[PDB]
Structures are given as C-alpha cells and as structure tokens.
C-alpha cells in the first residue's frame, strides 16, 4: 500500500454584496409662492428611484 | 448589520403672500358748483373696493 500524495488547499469566501443605487436629485425643493400651492401643495412625481443589489435577505 | 444608504435633502419654504388688489378709480374728484352741493355735499357710492389675499393674520 505504497502512497505518494499531493494536497491542494481550496479557500472559498462569499463576500456580501450590498448596494443601494439611487437615481434622481439629492435635493428635493418645494417652493410655495401661489395661493393654490399653499392650499394644495406641490406633488412631485418620480423624484427619486432606488435600485437594490444584494446577496442575502434584505429589508428596505 | 451591513448598511448601504442613500440620502435626499428636502427644503420647504413658506413664502409669505401679501396682496391688496384695489378696483375703482385712483382719483376721486368732488366738484361743488351748485348751492345744494355746497350745503349737503357729494356722496359717492362704491368708489373703491379692496380684495385681500394673505397667508398669515392680517389687519387692514
């Protein structure tokens, strides 16, 4: 039972990837100068959007 | 507790709205040429009207 052997060591790392990419304007400005704006207020549509890249279970 | 975050800054300004709109004649003329006008005087009805648009408490 003569034995000649060679060994290799395998190292595997699962680095966590957590990315939150936001597109839009980092300043959102509401300007009230008319009466209508005062009574009803500015409604801004699609100001900021968020995209999520993840490896594990995530909650935003 | 890996964290990926994005921040947006919201700026809200409440600009004061103060409007006094006058309708009528900016010159009001009283002409006295008859005796009756002298003794009793001209009475002018609805010479000037004022409309107020405001955001805060106001006194006219």
Experimental method: cryo-EM
Say if CB B5 and CB A20 are below 8 A apart. Answer: yes
Question: Among B53, B4, B31, which Cα is nearest to A33's?
Answer: B53
List Cβ neighbours of A29 (8 Å cut-off, separation of 6 or more). B10, B11
Lookup: tokens for B59: 């006194």
Give the integer Cα–Cα distance in Å for A58 and A30: 32
Chains A and B form CB pairs within 8 A to the count of: 47
Name beta bridge partners: A7.
Answer: none
A27/B8 CB distance under 8 A: yes
Please give the resolution of this entry in Å, rounded to 1 decimal: 3.5
**Which chain B residue is nearest to residue A34, measuring alpha carbons?**
B17
Taking the C-alpha atoms of residue B2 and residue A18, their distance in angstroms, rounded to an integer, is: 7
Convert A10-24 to b/e letters by CB count within 10 Å (16 or more is b): eeeeeeeeeeeeeee
């Amino acid at each position: 039972n003569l034995i000649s052997e060679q060994n290799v060591t395998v190292t595997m790392d699962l680095q966590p990837v957590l990315q939150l990419s936001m597109q839009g304007s980092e300043t959102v400005s509401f300007v009230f100068s008319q009466i209508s704006e005062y009574i009803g207020g500015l409604t801004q549509y699609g100001a900021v959007d968020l995209s999520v890249s993840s490896t594990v279970d995530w909650c935003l």
